[model samples]
Target: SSPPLSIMGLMPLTKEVAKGSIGRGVLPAVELAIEQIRNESLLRPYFLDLRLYDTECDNAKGLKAFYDAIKYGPNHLMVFGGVCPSVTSIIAESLQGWNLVQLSFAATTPVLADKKKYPYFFRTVPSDNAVNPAILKLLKHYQWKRVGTLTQDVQRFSEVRNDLTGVLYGEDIEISDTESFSNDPCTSVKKLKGNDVRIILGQFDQNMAAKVFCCAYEENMYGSKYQWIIPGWYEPSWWEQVSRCLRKNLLAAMEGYIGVDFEPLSSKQIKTISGKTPQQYEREYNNKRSGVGPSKFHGYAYDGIWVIAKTLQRAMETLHASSRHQRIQDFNYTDHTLGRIILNAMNETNFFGVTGQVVFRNGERMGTIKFTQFQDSREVKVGEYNAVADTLEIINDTIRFQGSEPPKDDYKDDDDK
Candidate 1:
């Protein structure tokens, strides 16, 4: 007795559609959300079906899958995915022409925050640039005037690096060296050391980080005096993953690293708009993942599904009560009215989600970030950064540094005999 709505997702599921065991983390979370949506009858007589296509995290392949989905599926009023920035950036812009909305759980390039270009794009996770202010605050806290910049020579990461550089420049901070690499970072990492860069703010993914740290280990650029501020969202013991960097070398090079990432879950005991506490959702999410554990942005994935459903629900309610004489099923690719209703509904979304407050302003989600440190081969929480009040809160006791004291920006020791 219910009409089904189809959401097209461009995920890196596999090379094939229905014959694989390679469903990545957060893939199950979205499924769980829709199941919960049905179980609770959040949108009575309106159910959602996810049509996932294999992007392989490649732009060309992603576009092909996107077009394929469009050609073969029913009316796609929306797009949802836990995907990489590379594919999202491409698919995001494409939605504008289709007059469709694309809400992402994973893609975090700051460029997508621009509503003028990819106006249809909305993401649950904080953009890579969201970490910039935290980095700026930490640098100010330490009174560090000089630093080095290292980055993966990719558009998404460089977009983040560029914004951070501008922010650093605004504060009169000097960048001693700025280096980037395509893949192998040996020469670039060596250049940082040769340039006498001790305080480095690096932008890269886990795989690139493994390469960069291996080079850091070989150059002996890490230890008591050097400080590295890296991305905090990398998994616990991420450096132990089998890249070229062995566990021991990776640990030695990464011992005193500092980082900042989104504060994933709300610690509040209050019930959320979903009628469940954050803790309860966390447990259910874990079981859904087969006890493997939640992905870093799985909460965002879960909440994004709710965002879509609720936004659709609100839109439907608005239509049913209005003179339009139409419903959600009346929407097709070119229906600007349906698109406008959803746009307004999403902008007005103000609910305490599992990922804290689920709201959007100019297509960007509002959330809190955190300060973190790598200690004893593990990631530890150290502080918090909130954008609403623009404050940085530090729990000084939790932060562990190797030297028992924060290190200087430069030690100037180049002698090894």
Candidate 2:
């Protein structure tokens, strides 16, 4: 075998997908791609070695992981993820001048789209801009013209709020109120209830959303009179983190609440690799590990790895041609030339990934989004947001309002108020 092409796989090892799809799914998918590539003999001399690190979904921890990985001296050509957008953003700042490439599976912050600021950054997930339009379209579909907004003190939430406001300005919608919460939950709830805002657009993660929901429940604002719309970044696993009593209250509070989420292509939903499916391989590796399940980002992670491999392969060929068929040993992986070539190849990446069509404009993936509702004690898929058409298609038969209550159009104009 030739020199090992080392890559760092960074993610939230202590978070929801730690033992489940992400840590297990993404890592295995990358390794599987490596195996398949090795069998092809095209990149026979070059081998891929993946080094995994746990960021715990914390910016400080992720920054520490980035520094530590470099200190450990793997001389990685690429870094797979920092899972959370904040994590990736934090780490990407330090990697801007370096020759290494950073590709994230789940970092969807729109700010990362600027190639001039962080040229080495790439991702398989769509930006918040892609999902924001879907959310605005969903609002238009329901005629929820007047709404309030709540966000957390996080970069992702800030980006979401910015995107939401940008789209709202263009639509016939009106923001009745806007508020952001830090560590204080009660104050945030008070602000949320200050106005007669029936529809609330929440741009918070699972934990912050839970706090908001719990506070709304306490304020009696979680009933059928109110509707909460959250972005797709809120995971379902947050339900298991609270006690049974809290969970009951949370579930009750979430009833009839509308949200947006990605339509995942799980391993079980796809064909097998060799004799076994990706899910089977994940299960075999997840032996004795807890909180394991299907991951929404598994396909994206797999595609992310393939994107790197394919682009690197292309870069190799280009370098050989430019150098007049120079030996693989003579080519330095750390050269800025390799990074530039790989970056160019990535910018032109277009394929049908397991998730869907793996394409990019700038550095974000383009795909369809889904709208979900909490009805009858579970999440119900009520509609799909077609990004290409810029339309929201709602399934009337699947749409069930909580407690059979219809949308209330009670908001008055500022002049009327």
Candidate 3:
């Protein structure tokens, strides 16, 4: 029996044939969401149901699975996890009409900032929009007025490139050269010379980023003033390799280059939430998962499910305690009771889950960003900047429910300094 609404998730966590922890890094957060809610007396009875469909990390499989989940009709409001920008965009584009209210935790292509058409969808991860300003701030800080970008010629990179360029253009910064790579481009970086490139903005995975950085160095790009900025694709812990590569004096030369990240937490908080400190998460992730740790976007899945559960709980409480006037206000033949309730509560929620302190203002998740740089094999967090601005500031970090603990700045300047 379906409750008034379903708190649902479409995921890719199961091992088809008992392959290793298929979604080990992510499942714990999901399980914790369930456990935390069950343990909370206020949330248990209100969240009527849950629907989790496995996409197995396959696009076609995900598309069909989501459609079937939609048919089950349990979820008045739904959330998605683990799909790439390409796939999630398609699902969102096709399903806005169902009032589905799909939110993506891991999709950050920067193309979803439209205010008019895609109101039904929301995302917890900061887009390239948020990332660009920080990137520019760093570029300006280092006086790297001219730069080069080597990006994949796909929708994902296109938006990142576009937004980055837009921010730079607004500041009259020159984009020295824009280069393209095939989707499966080899790990061989091309040489650059006298290209006005004081810094490089690369959008690719660890291997790809390494390819570009190494190639640039071979071309004499890693001198005292030259730098590189790698996106979320490459975790900041790449410092070990950075150390080995820079043994002959490049580390001091590259001091000003910093990578934009989510927020940094006090050492204790890092150990408590992740069960591993920043050091441990970085090492384990690199060892276990193809040398790449969990993507911040992946945590969106963890946040999305928790948000849905919390919203459902809030909605039930609101509806049940309504006055006569409130009941009449909601009484309607065709109105979606569950969807409306969840949407309203979503507008009021602020929580701290795997995605960090979660809050939505003006339809986007507002959170701080972590700025990291290499310091002798350490992914040192150097700064924390406000990710939410005028158009999207979380009015307060406080959550009226959940002990009314307001969102606080959990940053540690010691590690960063």
Candidate 4:
């Protein structure tokens, strides 16, 4: 902690986090959490400088965020933030040469988990590989047999889409049709063929879920027994709003719709907060934020920061013990040098972080998230789930899937447009 500005915070998907935020229809929970982290006088100097960079969840924007951080903030040794896989992949590809270390609380890509492609990248969030099995197990349990999918055409969501194919293979269910759509819910739902689709495994938003239902109804696809399997899209804040949107616009088409999420805050095990306790911190965060506490993501972010702090603190110790060249070179083997050393020093990381279990070995985490479904307009934590690569899980009825060789991209953009 010798360097005054050793940590930097960048929010690549400011747009997603801000969606339904306040009057925008996205809950600004992340914005609120960052504010809380900032305003919490207790966090003080430990949080040296928290900078926000808007990746807009776009690839080019994410690249710009990465280079800009590197250009102007050389003193910052660590980074946290980035909401989408697309943006983080850009960061992973671009950040290899620099000594800067990146940590994400929410980027759930196995590419980031691998030290080969992205050695500098560490995520506090579980990878899609770990979360995908829970989804497959749940779908199998339902025995729906035949299910079409409408999934976001992004790396993260597509991974889930591919997993469904593998998990449900040989079952009666067949993906009657598959379509790729933009990340925007309105545009995505508008592109769907109809309710011929059995389940939807969408990326991050509740408003989009409502809009998709609305679009489905508008296209004459509304019917009973239809189910939706959302992936971390509907947190508590806008659950009611999402339901209301579906009811009004889609005319009650999603009565039996199912949604999935990683662990929400209420499920976390509490120990201590502000000389009080985890329960006490939850009460305080809820009271101050007006219906907010440590979300599954908050713990991910919280753990992300702690991990960086612990790693860098060890790095600092190593640097102090050696010359500058050795200090920089030591970073190459920091996973073994700094990361392992720190883990050995701390006998217990017994804290129950928001996402799930928290433990690291050789720079990899063993945290596992459970699967849950939303039925009867409430969250039902189903027990059928497993962790994949410490990031993915089957808990939410969605999986991080991989398919056979992709069909040739021979079609031209304007072939039919």
lDDT (Cα, tens digit) per residue for candidate 2, span 16-63? 543324666556555566666678755557876678888877778778
Among the numbered candidates, top lDDT falls to 1
TM-score list, all predictions: 0.81, 0.75, 0.68, 0.58
Which residue pairs clash within candidate 3?
A: 105-300, 106-297, 261-370, 262-369, 262-370, 381-416, 382-416, 397-407, 398-406
For model 3, the superposed segments whose C-alpha errors exceed 4 Å read: 1-4, 17-24, 73-76, 80-82, 114-117, 143-146, 169-192, 235-257, 263-302, 313-341, 351-355, 361-363, 374-380, 389-417
lDDT of 3 by residue, 1-417 (tens): 212445446656565622113344555545544555556643543443556777766678778877787666554455555345555666767644555667766656666666465565677776666767777665565455667776877666677777776677667467767777864333323533444454567776555554455455556555344456666436445534541244334443334445665542322244423344445534443444453334434355556666776666676678778663243124332145545655677787676554456788655777666666554444455555555442212123211211122111112212331
Best by TM-score: 1
Give the runs in model 4 whose Cα sits over 4 Å from its true position.
Answer: 1-5, 12-74, 84-87, 108-117, 127-131, 140-148, 152-156, 163-227, 232-251, 266-278, 286-296, 313-351, 359-417
Better of 2 and 3 by lDDT: 2
1-417 in candidate 4: lDDT tens per residue? 432434556664333554212211112333434444456633333454556666766777768776786677545555667567777777766444554466676766655656677666666566665555556555556554455567665665676677666766665556655666664455445544443454555453455566666666665444332456666445554545543244544545544455554453424345522233345544544554565323446556655554544454454465567555345333433243444334333323333444445555333455554555444445555543324332333344432211222111122221232
Off by over 4 Å in 2: 1-5, 11-21, 42-75, 84-87, 107-117, 127-130, 183-194, 205-211, 214-225, 231-252, 266-296, 317-329, 386-396, 402-417
**Residue pair clashes in candidate 2:** none
Q: Judging by TM-score, tell me the better candidate of 2 and 4.
A: 2
In the order shown, what is each candidate's alpha-carbon RMSD? 4.3, 5.3, 10.5, 10.6
* Two-way TM-score contest, 2 vs 3, winner: 2
Q: Candidate 1 regions off by >4 Å?
A: 15-24, 49-61, 169-176, 181-198, 205-221, 233-250, 291-294, 317-326, 332-334, 408-417
What CA RMSD would candidate 2 show? 5.3
lDDT of 1 by residue, 1-417 (tens): 677777887677674542122336777777778887889888778788777787887788889988888888887778887376677888888776787788887777787987888998888878888888777878888777789999898876888888886667668578889998897889988998888887899888888888887889989888877889988778676765555657788889988788878887877678887788989988877777786444677788889888988888888878888886697766555378877777777877877888888877788877778788888768888888766556778885887655656666765432321
Q: What is the C-alpha local distance difference test score of each model?
A: 0.79, 0.70, 0.55, 0.51
